[PDB]
């Protein structure tokens, strides 16, 4: 069974290093690539740094200046150091695994850690009765949602891993319902849930490649269902 | 470090036998009890049962008609097996352990399992101002709450597991601030929240041992931190 786990110090001082580590099973480090995603607290998923089955490294810019991230494939281990961290870098830190044809589909329960440039929009909220359908549209650039077919969409019940739903704009993850749909009209994404249930009640992310080689999220949208 | 993990199907169809494996790391289910709990959605903790370090079996009166609990000491491994499984049975199914002298210290991070194919009374809401007070109450009665200093108090926010504030009554679990109290007279217990931080809004719940070699949670409480 595909298992990633996040462990390291929950509590940093300003100006030292954050270093987490990710212990992967039911897979090789060599065979898919890791990502690190985090999550300041009433904020969105922000990309972090990749390394993939080469050992090859993508960051954030934002982060770039601060951030390492190694492997040790013999241990099944890929590990994150962040330096010179304030309390803007207090977040719940995920690990997840990028595949070849399956998308970010797993993903660590994630690990709060305290110290103590295109963009992504998207509506706040949205709402709907049972049944019923809704929409959710994410705008970018010719960049980013524009650039291809790159586009990936997730669910988030808050205090929990989030949930692939959509990978390459239209392609439905395994496991999820098909009641699910992606399109993409070249510059704007668009989730569709055509028959609205209970637990569909969560956060949605939209997320994106960049020409830069780089990941890039929404703002997010809460979904309400009215009894 | 000290770590749980709750495993088995997160699908199970009605009237067959659900299955989980709690597979336990950094010390030996023969020093340290190890109980589960479950959740179901929107509604209270609920104590399942219970194997201590001789092996000694203890089942939630409720459930003990269905229950099941080995243990594998050489694998590290507890199991639950709950037969005869109804819609009734979905919840977030949570591994913890026992200790002589530091409370249920350790928690998984807990499983969902869903059932598909298509007392101890607490003030249910409390409030309190940002480095103010706030008080919660569990009533009870002379067998469980009013017996022994077997009282402990549980934070809950919702997407995690239960993290231990008080063991014995009055005890502040390890790593836990100071602005916790607890207070003990008759047949009631008292959590004490003295210095208000946004981060203290959750879920608290009151736990009792009892005359019959049970433990019994509290209705739980949510606490709002108003700006």
């Known amino acids: 069974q595909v298992q990633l786990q996040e462990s390291g110090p929950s509590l940093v001082k300003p100006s030292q290093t954050l270093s987490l580590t990710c212990t992967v099973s039911?897979?090789?480090?060599?065979?898919?690539?890791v990502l690190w995603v985090r999550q300041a607290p009433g904020k969105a998923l922000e990309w972090v740094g990749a390394?993939?089955?080469?050992?090859?490294?993508y960051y954030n810019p934002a982060l770039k200046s601060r951030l390492s991230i190694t492997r040790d494939t013999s241990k099944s281990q890929v590990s994150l150091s962040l330096s010179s961290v304030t309390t803007e870098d207090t977040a719940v830190y995920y690990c997840?695994?990028?595949?070849?044809?399956?998308?970010?589909?797993?993903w660590g329960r994630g690990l709060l850690v305290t110290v103590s440039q295109a963009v992504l929009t998207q509506p706040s909220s949205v709402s709907g009765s049972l049944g019923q359908s809704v929409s959710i549209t994410c705008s970018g650039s010719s960049s980013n949602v524009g650039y291809g077919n790159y586009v990936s969409w997730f669910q988030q019940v808050p205090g929990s891993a989030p949930k692939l739903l959509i990978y390459g704009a239209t392609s439905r993850a395994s496991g999820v319902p098909d009641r699910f749909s992606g399109s993409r009209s070249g510059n704007t994404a668009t989730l569709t849930i055509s028959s609205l249930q209970a637990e569909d009640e969560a956060d949605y992310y939209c997320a994106s490649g960049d020409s830069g080689s780089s990941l890039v999220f929404g703002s997010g949208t809460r979904l309400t269902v009215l009894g | 470090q000290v770590q749980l993990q709750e495993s088995g199907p997160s699908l199970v169809k009605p009237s067959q036998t659900l299955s989980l494996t709690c597979?336990?790391?950094?010390?030996?289910?023969?020093?340290?009890?190890?109980?589960?709990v479950r959740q179901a959605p929107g509604k209270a903790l609920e104590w399942?049962?219970?194997?201590?370090?001789?092996?000694?079996?203890?089942?939630?009166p409720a459930l003990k008609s269905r229950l099941s609990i080995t243990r594998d000491t050489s694998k590290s491994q507890v199991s639950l097996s709950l037969s005869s499984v109804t819609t009734e049975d979905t919840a977030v199914?949570?591994?913890?352990?026992?200790?002589?002298?530091?409370?249920?210290?350790?928690?998984?991070?807990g499983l969902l399992v869903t059932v598909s194919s298509g007392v101890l009374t607490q003030p249910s809401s409390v409030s309190g101002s940002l480095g103010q007070s706030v008080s919660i109450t569990c009533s009870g009665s002379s067998s469980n709450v009013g017996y022994g200093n077997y009282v402990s108090w549980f934070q809950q926010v919702p997407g995690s597991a239960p993290k231990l504030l008080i063991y014995g009554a009055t005890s502040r679990a390890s790593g836990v601030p100071d602005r916790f109290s607890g207070s003990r007279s008759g047949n009631t217990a008292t959590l004490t929240i003295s210095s208000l931080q946004a981060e203290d809004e959750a879920d608290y719940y009151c736990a009792s041992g009892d005359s019959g070699s049970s433990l019994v949670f509290g209705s739980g409480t949510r606490l709002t931190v108003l700006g």
């Open positions: 039911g897979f090789s480090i060599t065979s898919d690539g």
């Open positions: 390394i993939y089955q080469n050992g090859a490294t």
């Open positions: 997840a695994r990028d595949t070849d044809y399956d998308g970010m589909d797993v």
